[PDB]
Design an enzyme around this catalytic site. Structure first.
Site, PDB file in Angstrom:
ATOM      1  N   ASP A   1       0.805  -1.307  -0.162  1.00  0.00           N
ATOM      2  CA  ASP A   1      -0.001   0.035  -0.080  1.00  0.00           C
ATOM      3  C   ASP A   1       0.974   1.502   0.055  1.00  0.00           C
ATOM      4  OD1 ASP A   1      -2.643  -1.733   0.425  1.00  0.00           O
ATOM      5  OD2 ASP A   1      -1.612  -2.023   2.357  1.00  0.00           O
TER       6      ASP A   1
ATOM      7  N   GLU B   1     -11.674   1.425  -4.063  1.00  0.00           N
ATOM      8  CA  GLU B   1     -11.010   1.846  -2.769  1.00  0.00           C
ATOM      9  C   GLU B   1      -9.633   2.665  -3.202  1.00  0.00           C
ATOM     10  OE1 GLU B   1      -8.702  -1.192  -0.435  1.00  0.00           O
ATOM     11  OE2 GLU B   1      -9.770  -2.478  -1.935  1.00  0.00           O
TER      12      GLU B   1
END
Lengths: 540, 540, 540
Positions: free
Chosen positions: A14, A187
């Protein structure tokens, strides 16, 4: 001159990547591993150095009792108004209809800290990102959780405006700016102001092989105003099943000082057992989600495209204005425990390394036996990521157990239900012995049992080694540091992979680690002393 | 004159019962429910009053993040040397090869407190019990956990001696005093000095239908010196499958001032659905493990026997020297929230009722929406045990949600994966609505969905009711408190039973509760106001 | 003088027992094993001889493709009108909402046959029993299957009258005579006319540890006219968890010539692994459901009671008029294959031993390799029951495989997903080798793999042996019949037990067998020759 992907090997998920002047920074998610949020710095994008983690106290991050693959999800690092802003998310639920999370804000004038006491911002969804508009307004953009089972669970991208004097959100300003595409699971939103448009990057498809990143744009921040890039997606390896890189998607766009464009993505290198189809299962990610960097160019209609096609490239041209950054040649680690604080590559589970867990310095690590690796509370363990497919790790340890409830040694761990180790313990027949055990989704095996190896009566220290060889690994021991014996079991490395854990648990977002631990579930605080730790990466 | 079993109805498990002068006290396990350790008092054994729970601060008990059916397992209350001693266990792991636990000691000169800051005693096993020898020596006697999968997990009864100056154990004194019988799972040990012998009571067979208590004796506290009672066990309902009482076993022996003898046991009253065999499943315990009291007599060889045979009796003669105790006629509860502190019958999940959860006083309960009932962290919820098979509960609540992530109402809960409720929330088309939802082992159902009931524009407060009728229950609502509508859904009460949870989870040690909660997983702290709570028990 | 229970050891389930003059006969269920329906004879009840099975042709019984634990369920043998009547049931579905069955009738004037071509009688339910009323009317009494999931599946005891001229039922006469007790699963009905009443015996609770038999009576055969015996049940071991006999229930009542009364019951002797609680699991039945005989007396109110209490006795007084019956001292078997037809103790799976499977005679068994033990079709296998806890079995076999798809040897088998064996096969590197394999609910293990034992170049025959030792067993081999090598693997006998199979499959009604088989799934019909088979029972 050449970025070699993955640039951040092993668990480095991430990526939030920014540039401040000539310096690039990447922040990665850390989940249950402490300290929270991993930071790296570079001036060339090729070579990267580890910085101190921001979330280093229980005031900043309190994860005792957190489920595995809860804790710190995707972080967001930004620079505006002469300081760093870090949005981070502590997730408390990993399975079922809910995913209760709190998004926090801390800031720093210096990337190394100190960081301000956190402000709670909101819940709403994870993947929260701070957008600094050029006009001085600020917003939070995030995923939107929906618990209602008769809807899709990822309910668009919410944008909410801050009161910038208090950095509290104004909830009445919330709106859905973008519903994503039919791949869903929208997302990882990031907003950028470029050439008079707001560009929205978002991840879709979930963070396994169907992962992708899509791009949308709007002249405004109005409700459902964002229009999808034609000929999408921006990045995916869903449709490149034989490519060295997989699972690319969730990531961040940065410019260079000269106006080039790069995109940091999470990525995996899943391998197969010899008897498996290469396409089912697509493979096992023991190194978890790592970070890659891809080059970006803009097409004539003003849409960003990955250089080399939507699957990206293994090797990528570094920025023209790159400034050479000196970094270690690999991620090998040779620790004498000479220093009073832990090497930065070490992490603990959930909580800081306190006097209760032990101490380091003067040539020794002392771990005070507390709870087992099966616990979400008070585990005296330090560990570092697997960052190569092949490596040897070694320690030398002294431990004096008087009950079988005392165990200490060298471990490989994914989570509380997925780990193995070789350890010193005590048995009723022989006294001090060596055993090897594996916990495989709570199917627990003691390999030697009654045939645990007797530690000879003169023996002070025992040496342990693990040899990891991609798909499998072994444990070895020595009573003198020179003559080694192999414990005759080959362990399956796939037990410590995201793709295996995913089969029976909804939190599978880290990666395998190797380290040292002591347990005493008799509660008598038996101390294990480790003289050194060596982690030696080998060629792939 | 007549003890009617169960004497402590609803969740009242693992009774430790003592006598001090003319007064009897029972301490029960509480698991994840706060405050920790339930206390009851009586002078007749027939009628019992609830006392303040000892473990009422986070200094005494910190269970944030604990798994359901972790936390406070069987407690041990003792009186010696002019004070109360409480041994309690915080269990952090409920499944797999390990069961990491810490045993603590607190003391008090008054049963109502205050209680001293706890000392950590050890791990080793749960069911730790303080034995006070008449000669002034003190010991911990406990179950013994064995994680080794090639052994039986309950490794005899460990006895370890205290240094009584510090109340720290001397580990070198540890020994196994008793291995139990072939039924195994030996636990719940209590030692008593009677007529020149040490008597050991121990539970066996696990706390389900194969539960039993056995008795052993020795002239010493030597390793494996205890001999089993002939013609055992002392108590079991394993072999009385049609009897009103089931699962009797784990418990404690007390004398009366006149030299009669009684035994408090945990017990259940499991019921069947209409179509089930009465013997498979043996049934569903919505009221969980309750407490019974049986009378004891001694045979000619000096062995204790339950009056009425080893299955016990429903009705039991009270002590000859019983002093009448007045208690409420039933466990009904009528709460106007007029007091600044919660009624003792209310519990919270894991953590104290702080300002962060809300407030009570001046006729109103305020709950600040935090995490959902699916969380092990920061849940704004108060609840009280189901203590009758049939009851009505009712509240009146005001809540102004602006997002579907805000929910507040009237709930029935067993654990984070087993609960239901009727609540006020918000939807996109109708605004303020009423929904009913059930979480059934993370199979989550919204019953009304788009047909959620619109709350009319006039409406301030909504009234909610649940009617529990043994095997099944319903929810109702009203906009005026007089005219009620039933939500046309019949819920299965077996979903909130020990025996159901046991099917897929190894922690199943509490019982069903009813109460009030507010959630805001948007993180905006939306406040629900409850004007009262009524819980009215109805005849069986 | 003394019946020693179980009288029929190993798989001998669902006894139907009658007396004709001075001779007793028991018929037992056989499920997928051929020939169908096991018959035994005695004149003392203590010693029993095996008779030829009635269902010995595909005209009588066609079970090719039947699921394991389908086929022949509880049979009913009766004698009236100068002939034997056999009601038998072929069950085609073992799991799910349905249990489609056909009940058939065959008859014989001689117990050894021949038997008449079967008449299909009905479905309705299993456990069909022919009641011959003294008034000349005849009825079928049976269990009643109900597929409706909102009802209990065992819908009382149906009684339907025959037209005795055609022996076809008159469906309009069907009625429920008895609903049973709260234990439910009412089945195994038998009617008896005694002292002016109709007595109904019925099994309840299912055929595991909650099994029981109940008794009811009526002056008529009217709908729901039967009244339950007070102080029941008649027989059960549910509440005798430590007793040597378990699972008693389903069975049949018979008188002796002198007016005494006996009851044959199915029964098990489940054993435990050393680490298990004796009461959970209650144990593993490798010998399956065997047959016991208990003595019956009538109380003053005319109700039958088992002598020794409702749990029965291990040792039982034989009939006063018993005629001592000559029978083998045990069930050992020493077979040289000298006869042209198979010893009666041998069974095949599903289908007769035809020339397609092979041949026997002049000192040799030839099995033609067809489908594997995993198939419900065309398996060239003969096997005999485990009838002692400890035994040695041995053979000598020649087989010349040229592919790994050809395998032949000595097996232990429960069903298609639960078996093991040592066998001759072929591998690519070594040629003819010896391997051991286990199928454990389709978790299939080859123990030796690449290290399969090379068969020396001159070797014609290989000798194989299995040593079964209650809880566990091994395989051995020899190239000369004198010098033996043990394959270093201990197999768990519990994998071939009813109680294990029940965990994952709803058909678990047989028992472990040992035998000989050849497979060739290359389809080239490779022939294995076996020179003998020895099965030697040892003391307990």
């Amino acid at each position: 001159m050449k970025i070699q992907n993955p640039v951040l090997p092993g668990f480095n998920a991430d990526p939030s990547m920014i540039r401040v002047g000539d310096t690039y920074y990447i922040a990665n998610s850390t989940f249950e591993w402490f300290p929270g949020v991993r930071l790296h710095e570079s001036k060339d994008l090729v070579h990267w150095n580890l910085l101190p983690s921001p979330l280093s106290t229980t005031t900043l991050l309190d994860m005792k009792g957190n489920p595995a693959s809860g804790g710190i999800w995707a972080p967001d690092l930004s620079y505006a108004d002469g300081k760093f802003w870090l949005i981070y998310t502590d997730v408390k639920i990993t399975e079922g209809p809910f995913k209760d999370m709190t998004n926090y804000l801390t800031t720093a004038t210096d990337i190394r800290g100190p960081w301000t006491d956190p402000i709670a911002v909101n819940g709403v969804g994870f993947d929260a990102s701070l957008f600094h508009d050029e006009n001085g307004r600020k917003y939070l953009v995030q995923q939107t959780w929906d618990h209602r089972e008769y809807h899709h669970p990822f309910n668009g991208i919410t944008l909410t405006e801050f009161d910038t004097a208090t950095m509290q959100l104004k909830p009445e300003t919330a709106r859905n700016i973008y519903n994503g595409t039919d791949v869903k699971l929208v997302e990882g939103p990031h907003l950028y102001q470029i050439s008079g448009y707001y560009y929205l990057f978002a991840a879709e498809g979930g963070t396994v092989f169907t992962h992708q990143e899509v791009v949308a744009r709007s002249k405004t921040l109005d409700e459902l105003s964002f229009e999808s890039e034609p000929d999408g997606p921006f990045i995916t390896n869903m449709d490149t099943p034989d490519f060295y890189l997989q699972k690319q998607g969730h990531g961040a766009l940065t410019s260079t000082p000269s106006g080039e464009w790069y995109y940091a993505s999470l990525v995996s290198r899943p391998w197969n057992h010899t008897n498996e189809s290469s396409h089912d299962p697509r493979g096992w990610s023991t190194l978890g989600r790592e970070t890659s960097i891809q080059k970006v160019e803009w097409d004539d209609a003003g849409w960003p495209r990955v250089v080399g096609g939507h699957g990206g490239q293994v090797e990528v041209d570094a920025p023209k204005d790159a400034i050479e950054t000196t970094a270690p040649k690999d991620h090998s680690q040779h620790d004498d425990f000479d220093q009073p604080t832990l090497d930065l590559n070490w992490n603990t589970l959930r909580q800081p390394f306190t006097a209760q867990m032990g101490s380091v310095g003067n040539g020794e690590l002392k771990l005070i036996g507390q709870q087992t690796m099966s616990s979400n509370f008070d585990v005296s363990l330090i560990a570092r990521r697997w960052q190569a497919f092949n490596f040897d790790a070694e320690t030398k340890v002294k431990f004096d157990p008087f009950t079988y409830q005392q165990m200490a040694g060298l471990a490989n761990i994914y989570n509380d239900k997925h780990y193995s180790w070789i350890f010193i313990t005590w048995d009723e027949k022989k006294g001090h012995v060596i055993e090897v055990a594996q916990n495989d989704n709570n199917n627990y095996t003691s390999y030697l049992k009654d045939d645990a190896i007797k530690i000879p009566d003169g023996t002070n220290y025992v040496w342990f080694r693990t040899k990891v060889r991609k798909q499998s690994y072994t444990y070895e021991y020595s009573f003198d540091g020179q003559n080694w014996e192999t414990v005759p079991v080959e362990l399956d490395a796939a037990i410590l992979s995201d793709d295996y854990v995913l089969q029976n648990y909804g939190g599978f977002f880290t990666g395998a680690f190797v380290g040292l631990m002591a347990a005493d579930y008799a509660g008598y605080k038996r101390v294990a002393t480790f003289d050194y730790f060596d982690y030696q990466e080998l060629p792939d």
